[model samples]
Each structure stands twice: as C-alpha cells, then as structure tokens.
Target: GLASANVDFAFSLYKQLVLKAPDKNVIFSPLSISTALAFLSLGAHNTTLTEILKGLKFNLTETSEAEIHQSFQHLLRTLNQSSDELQLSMGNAMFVKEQLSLLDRFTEDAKRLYGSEAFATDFQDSAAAKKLINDYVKNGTRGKITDLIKDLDSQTMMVLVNYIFFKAKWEMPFDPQDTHQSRFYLSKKKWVMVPMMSLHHLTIPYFRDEELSCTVVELKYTGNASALFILPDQDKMEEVEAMLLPETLKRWRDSLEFREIGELYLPKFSISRDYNLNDILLQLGIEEAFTSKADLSGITGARNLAVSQVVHKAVLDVFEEGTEASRTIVRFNRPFLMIIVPTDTQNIFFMSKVTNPKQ
Candidate 1:
C-alpha cells in the first residue's frame, strides 16, 4: 500500500473518515492514521498490533517532546513485558523525510554488501508525499513536526510518519452566535459548559430501541467514500451497543428514510488517535508473528532468527483551545457510530522483506 500513493490523496481519504462521523465533534486528524500506520509497519511481527490501537488514545503535545519520548520508551518496555516471543525493531528520526532516503540506502546497502533483496517505497503516486506533508507541518504550527520525523537514520529499519494539514470551514460552520456555555455531564457528576454545535434542522435517520432513541449523521466524501455516525439515547448506550448487529447495522445503513428534523445538538472538540496494530492483529488471529516460528520469510528470506518480541507505539491528540474554527465534537450517551471505510484511494502503506544480498 505504501508502494504507491499520493499524500494529498491519502489525506483526502483520511478526511472522508473524519467527516463521516455521526458527531462532527469526534474528529480524527490525518496524522493519527498516518502515525498508526507507521507503528503497524514497524511492528509487523505482532499480529495484534491493530487490535490495541482501536481503543488507544493518541495525545499530542500533552507534554514536552522529551517527556513524550520517555513515555514512548515506557510503552515499549510495558509491551515487551507482556510477550517473550516477539522482537521489536525500530528507530526514530528527527529529519522530516529522512527515512525515505534511509530506507533506500538500507536496502541498497544490503544489496551491495550482503546481496539481499530490498527496495523502499517512495510512494509512487506522490513522490513528494513526505515533502508536501512537511510543508504542511511548517505552515500548521509554525514548524512543530519539523522536529518530529527527523530522527530516522541508518539503524532505523522502519519509520512511522504523521502529518495533519489543511483547514475546512464547515459548510454551515457552527454559528459562534448560537454557541453557549452549558453543563456537560461526566461519570462522577462531572459537569462543564462545553460550547456545543447548534443546528437549525437536519434530516438524519431516527430509530427507537428498548430505552432510548438513535439518530444518524452522515459525512460524505469525494469518490463515493462515506462514514455514518449513530448516536444512541444518552442513557441507553449499553443496551444499544448490546443490540448492534450486522442485520441491524445493515438496516440502519440501508433503510434510511428522510424526514424534517429540528435543532440538533452536537459537541465541539477535535481528537486524533494513533495506534500500533499489534493488539489489533492479535485479535484478528495473527498469533504467528509473536511466536518464535514467525514466518517473516518475506522479510528475511527464511532467516534463522525468529521475531522475539514486538514493541508497539501509538499516540492520539485532541485539542479544543485557541483555534479559529470551533473543533468538531462528539458525545457518547450510549451507542455511538464509527463506520470508517477507506475507499480504494490507497491510503495504506505497508512494507515487509527478509533476505541478505545473494553473495
């Protein structure tokens, strides 16, 4: 997947994922998926990589870079503690697109010195994928990620890259005129006034369950890609979640009848979640990568050594302060919607190989 792609196209694909959320409040920045993909590739041996990321939170700028690095290190240590059958191979880069060159050089060196079969993806569709993204980074925070992806070097066999860019003013950008401070309820009587997005009328699907009602919001994308957001009544999340089914989901997705709607209340926040695919992979029945007999043959050409452990790293960020546009937000009362499907826009990048030069 990484073999060919356009960074803009990738971001566009990611944008579709963000817009499709039923609650505009829950937004997933493009950076989240990109970084998660990077970790998934780095820990390819861990079949569970993907599973762990689903529920993982990726917080950015939560602390100093040094602190974040330490936290990453701590994560590696914790994951390593859980398994003895996997091996983690990784490196960090501070030079924005340095890994692109490093990957090529590593493979070329392997071919020249050890006679190994290797090649790196420059991402065929957009050779400037990394560069363009870097440019976006510079413009976004006046150059924060400028210091982020530059750490890749010769010893770094894999690189995880992420960039969030562009700004889309909502079609009917939440009117600042309607926003108001109100009490928000959290588990322990946590109440706060979170400026909520106000809508005049939206003809979203409505359904009734045992104890609560459900409503749907649709985020449409270019090229027929879309996501559906389903919000169950505030107190019936468990029951609604329990009743979710392929049939019900299919019905909700298929039998959509439109009607005149009234004022819709939504939250205002932005969240980006990045995850290492290790735990996700484990859930998907990929136990081999963690076993001593992991057949990373494609990566090592029937090599003798087996993957001993996999260290998964993930990050997510949600920011709601000091931005021009109100942050898109979502609130969970009971059952929520997260139907993300990546149309064949080729946003996924993956690489694997195993072989020493044929000396």
Candidate 2:
C-alpha cells in the first residue's frame, strides 16, 4: 500500500511541477525525490513525521510507519533489480559532520531499507566537504550528474543526497541517416530549427484523448523502461497538464493500441537540470523539517538536526539506434510533456516538459 502511495505521490508532484514552472523546461525524478524524502522520514518523529507523510499525500489514518518503510523497501528492491539492457543506478547517502553522532537505528535503517550509505566529513571545511559530497554523487550517477552540491552550510549537521541515472536504447533504433534539421514549434507562431529524427512505417502504442486534445505515444526502450510523450493539440497543453493524474495516466496507458504510421519524426535531445527543493517542498506543505522546531531527534537524539537543503539533479537523452523501436504518423514537432518510467515498477525516474529544445 505504501508503494502505491509512492506512485500517487509521484503523480501529484508532477502536477505541482507543471504548475510551478509553467513556461520553463522542466525535468526531475519523482522517484528520486520520493525516495530521498522517504529516507529522511526515517529520522522524522511526532508531528514532523506526520507532516511529511501528509505532504507526500499519504492517508496517515490508514498507513502505519512500519508499513510505509516496508513499502519503500519493496520499491527499492524492485527498482534496483539487475537488468542487462537498462543502465540505471539509484543511490542515496548522508554526509554528516565528523563530530556529529548519528543514531545507529537511523543509519541502519538507511542502509537496510534505502541502501543509503553514510559518510562523515568535516563541515567546518565547507569546500572540502562540498567536494566530497559532489564527487560521490557524480560517481553514483555515473558522471551524468556533477556539481550537485554547490555549497555547504558550515553548521550543516547532515546533508542527505539521492541521485538516479538512467540510459537505454530504443527498442527499435532510428536510422541516423534519416535525422535532419527541422522546424520545431515553440509556440503557436514561434518556431526554431532542431535535429529531428525520423522513422517510416513503424507501429507503436498510440492513443488520442478527446478531453485533453492530445495524442499520446509510448516508445519502449530495450529494457523494462519506456517513454510516454504527450503532444497536446496546439495550445491545449495547459488543459492536458491540469488533468494529469494517476488514474488518467493508467487510463491513457491502458487505452493505447498498436497503430501503424506513415512517418514518425522525433527530435534528438539531451538535457540536464539541477534543483534546490527547499521552496518547492515548503509549497507542498513540508514545513516543519526546515525549521528549528523540526523533530528529527531520531537522527541524533538531540532534536537539533534540521534539513539545511535538499538538492536534486537529473539528465535524459533521446536518440535513434536501438534493439528495434513504433507506429503512428506521430510527429513530435511541437512542445510536449514526457514521462520516462520503468515498466516493472511505478517509478518515474525522469519527467519533463520541452517547450524549447534550444534551451
């Protein structure tokens, strides 16, 4: 049930993200964010724990702390299972001040339940500690993410970090020769030229939503992951985005049927984004954790530990050349929203809205 809760929370967060940054390009891993918060919740107590659970959209009346953690463990186990085709690495760590003593239970649960390792460093030397944290994250994400921690607070007791890096080839590779420059609509009238990859006469899962006025396409990767691209009918993006929900996504996925297309054109793109989530989390009603009143005594038994910051960074790439890769005259020539999710689990490793490819 808690694993299900994580899925619901991820969708809710995605909707919030679309509202938070409407005009800008958006990208983040809801799975990574939820997992990081789940790890942090291990050290939360009393109202702090309750607030976090509620903010994550958990119906606390029906869920117990033990059950929630167990669900997180299940989620991790399922997602971290080894696969040859899906190159995915999700990791968590807590960089603590060398002099600060963390409760054994807290550290133990972090590793046992979340696979998060603990590192002790001297926060007094901000530069050195920052470098250590960043280096670990860069390696964890297979060098896809670097400079995650821009600076470290001198009084920072512990900094919790999580990162996810995913890479997979298309199920059917797009011929590189067919890729050429094409005009992409940034808005109703504005356009920009970008490298667009094309494929002819391929069949992929496709759906059309009359309510949202969008065409949805599911493109599978070689592994257990797939990307769902939603292209809203010219200017109906806001309407479609506002309707994004867990049930809606499931409905869309279930309704999709294999369809043949004459030509498929998709842009080749690579993008990365770094986020400081303090404000966004606050907006989402996780208020106590950042204040002095935070009840994180489960961490150090002193009730002094509060989250100084939460940082996340992610990257995604789409190109041609895969094991075999879809149908439909689906031409992603306009702005659209993308969700890169794993088929085996309800984990959204990456989601983004691409309005301008040049950004």
Number of the top-ranking candidate, with TM-score as the measure: 2
Best lDDT goes to which candidate?
2
RMSD of each: 16.8, 2.6
In TM-score terms, candidate 1 sits at 0.46
lDDT of 1: 0.36
lDDT of 1 by residue, 181-286 (tens): 5545543354445555566665544443443366655433332233345676656544554465444545665655555556655555433333233343344334
Error of 2 at 329 (Å): 2.1
User: Over the full model, what C-alpha lDDT does candidate 2 score relative to the true structure?
Assistant: 0.78
Worst 10 residues of 2 by lDDT: 319-328
TM-score of each: 0.46, 0.92
